């Protein structure tokens, strides 16, 4: 009852949105499935299973981590992270379940078996599930279908109410290419509507993948890669992760700079400010073939190296205020400079 | 508390310039990123991932070895070397 | 008897006999002082778990402690080596055999040793090598200090002191001390400190992966860590081994031995990080003492002479006469 | 008539609450079964059986000792404790019954046989019954078949008026997090049915043995207020020891209790909080007496070092290479002039 009122007040979708940005259709789909499960009537005969499709930088694993942060307070216990990268052969399926009698490690059992034995309602995440051998997905079949897993010692574990998340990155180039084509077509249509004076209709910023695309190109790619149609048939939701928009890129760079400023304020009590051209320059250092990781490793080569290199010169006292500005000599082309603002609104450049 | 003063005395850019001459852009980049790591102004949730593209026998292994020698007194335990040419098959 | 313990605190004796480990010695000294003041709970014995690398001094610390509490180690020191107890049936070396079986009248070894001296310090040496079932045997010995023999007899050891030396989480703390070797030596009194959250967030997974019982680790009073030797501690170890050999020579045949400040560096150069004090010990025993024994067979060392160890411009033994003239010794 | 009057006046639950705290569901269950015992309305053909389950240091074996102390004034004579740790092998069952007539030591008999011959009404504590071999417990239900065990010499012992308490640590984990997930707070019947029952049946391997048990008792780990109450009870105990041995009065703050509850581990139980009380309060409390800094009749207060208070008041996430320093408890002699005198050795 009190948990119901907490869910009606603050759903998991606002927690995901305040933790990770964008991905509104993906957050809607995952939160809808959690909404069906948590409402006290979900079919216990089959567990919820998700497959995530998206590019390299988009936080599918981050979304799974925040979903498991929502579902259980213990991220170390209630959430089982499992990389599929080291399950590259068929005999690696032994690490999934254990060992037959008469062999080493038979007394220890299997990892996912005992980790599902400790808590049956666990959020089990499979990272890079496309990069494992298909005979490892073969044992994931009857795990997903009925929630029963057989140990190497004859024990059967019911993961009947568990939640399984798979993160895969196949067909990411095709998803990104078709999303870019849809966005440029919608931008051309919207610019023609603007030039023809149509502004009385709320042009909502949500472009969706059709079912025909989902059956026609993505489905044979998934069928060619996973090479078992029953494995795609057992998956309850297929969730797509669209590439970032320009305003989403701005929201991402402000989120990362706010993380840096919050770390500085809660560790050394230093306040820092950014301008609009600085944010535009930081968006300009984005690679399309990657995503938020490109920003996550160019901000330090653009900004935080200049903050850290100033820090051994003792130029940053307690309570000082910094502002990052685009370089006036490099406004024509492109570098950033720190600028400490005094109490009398005077500015000092850091060499 | 004396480590930042020691690095202010002898930065690793000068140590690497003494050990390896040439390619000062590489030295500046690795020194800046290492300085961000060892100052503490660095996101600890991800490791520091360097990629070096170079010609054959230009000093990249020597650069990583001197970086590990600067970071760790014991390079037998504090440094790992792996040859990817052996690891062809799965 | 407070005057005697004020004259000779055990920290002074321990630092006199073992070097290094300023925190471990202080920890065991604080616990033994709590026992000495008469304000420990008399129902519960003291249980210690020692975590340290090879050749650091855990077994020697337990031996010196039990040398302090009891004057005779044949009665007041009960040491059981866990290297025998690798199997599940080795349990039957603590308690007696069940009645009607072989060796039933022989009785329990640990029950007999605790019955000979109930106050005796018990050292469970190298508890890494024990089976996990033997841990559950001495579960009740740590819980109440009460052990039941195979004949129905029952021994009480509430006043006894239980020391266990282990090797399980020895690497990680050393790795922790590795950053401390890059922090506490670069902090330049100065000390090497292990963080308090480390014992509960990282060490307890190794202790649970090895001992597997929460109750075993809960029954242990104190967890005492041992830190790897620093440079000055290795210097003090080299001078201590050389002083031991010089004292032995002066007691035996009145032979004075001298080493400069510069000599100890080449002996610290003969050190393995994976080894411990025993590496420095047998390096001193090999490089220096073999020349002394070879000269002692050859009658090249008359009594009352003065010898100096000198580094080559090899450790050469040079006779120093009253006229300040170095004489090299030619050893065949 | 006096026994019924003292049962009306002082029932054993109040004595239990004086001796041990928390676990009021377990106290009520064991006390109600003992009330069923002491009014004479109990079947003698099935002696009362308790199977105590809980974590480490949660309150099982001290509760069994306090039950033994309540029923029997001479606990060393009228209370029998058997550690099932030694009975890890099958042949240790020969410890129970004694030898066959002639083999090595035959006239000695089993220790249980002699101990129940001396007192048939003695409460018997099989503690850590999970440490025993699965074979041994398949003898044990014959001791609950009709309350009889037969010696090798034929000396059958009748123990109808006995109380058989077995403590264990099977399946204590999800019981502990099930008590955690509910924050009277008691275990649900559904969790008793569909979780702990198949684990018990699979571990014991003979479900007739679970048939022999009269009552399964579940223990729950400690909440915050009862943890503070443990700190208050332990400092009361140590102050009482200082009064009856050297006349020393101790005062401890609510910040002191907050500091001592900050040093707690859930899995280790009350032994961990007892050890951190002993390592910090008792340590300098006796180090002061080593220098004779505490005269007889003096009065002390416990304070906290000022450095770690500002760290504790700000709950910030630390780095894995960060070093967390414990707040340090300092002794102060409180003078009659409303003044404090610190102790620094
Ligand atoms: N939309 C987003 N909002 C906030 N942070 C994001 C977002 N997308 C990515 N990130 C950040 O970038 C990281 C990239 O995601 P993560 O490494 O968890 O998995 P992934 O990108 O799904 O993985 P993969 O390499 O398999 O594609 C996240 O951990 C997060 O810090
Ligand atoms: N700190 C020390 N100071 C002086 N001598 C030491 C020290 N530590 C060890 N030694 C010497 O080295 C010997 C080796 O120590 P010992 O045999 O007690 O085992 P240990 O160091 O505890 O290791 P292990 O775990 O292998 O038993 C000691 O007997 C002693 O002679
Ligand atoms: N009810 C209780 N509340 C708090 N602490 C308790 C309680 N009962 C016991 N303790 C503490 O725990 C210690 C162990 O108690 P006891 O030997 O009776 O077993 P237990 O806690 O029930 O469990 P275990 O047998 O697993 O150790 C006692 O010495 C005491 O310090
Ligand atoms: Mg990922
Ligand atoms: Mg030693
Ligand atoms: Mg017990």
Author numbering:
A (entry chain B): 298 to 630, 646 to 663
B (entry chain A): 298 to 387
C (entry chain G): 300 to 487, 501 to 625, 647 to 665
D (entry chain H): 298 to 480, 503 to 664
Which of the paper's sentences describe this entry?
Two mutant versions of CLPB (NBD and NBDE425Q) were analyzed by cryo-EM, which again confirmed that E425Q mutation resulted in co-purification of an endogenous peptide in the central channel. After several rounds of 3D classification, 3 different oligomeric arrangements, hexameric, heptameric, and nonameric, were identified. The nonamer appeared to be more stable and could be resolved at an overall resolution of 3.7 Å, allowing the atomic modeling of the NBD of CLPB. In the nucleotide-binding pockets of the nonamer, a total of 8 ATP molecules could be modeled. The conserved residues I317, I318, and F541 form a hydrophobic pocket to stabilize the adenine ring of ATP, while T358 stabilizes the β- and γ-phosphates through a Mg2+ ion. In the nonamer, 9 protomers form a 1.5-turn helix around the central substrate. The density of the polypeptide backbone is well resolved in the nonamer and was modeled as a 17-residue poly-alanine fragment. For each protomer, a canonical PL-I (399-GYVG-402) binds to the peptide through 2 hydrogen bonds formed between the main-chain atoms. The first is between the carbonyl oxygen of the substrate residue N and the main-chain nitrogen of V401, and the other between the carbonyl oxygen of G399 and the main-chain nitrogen of the substrate residue N+2. Thus, the axial step size of PLs is exactly 2 residues.
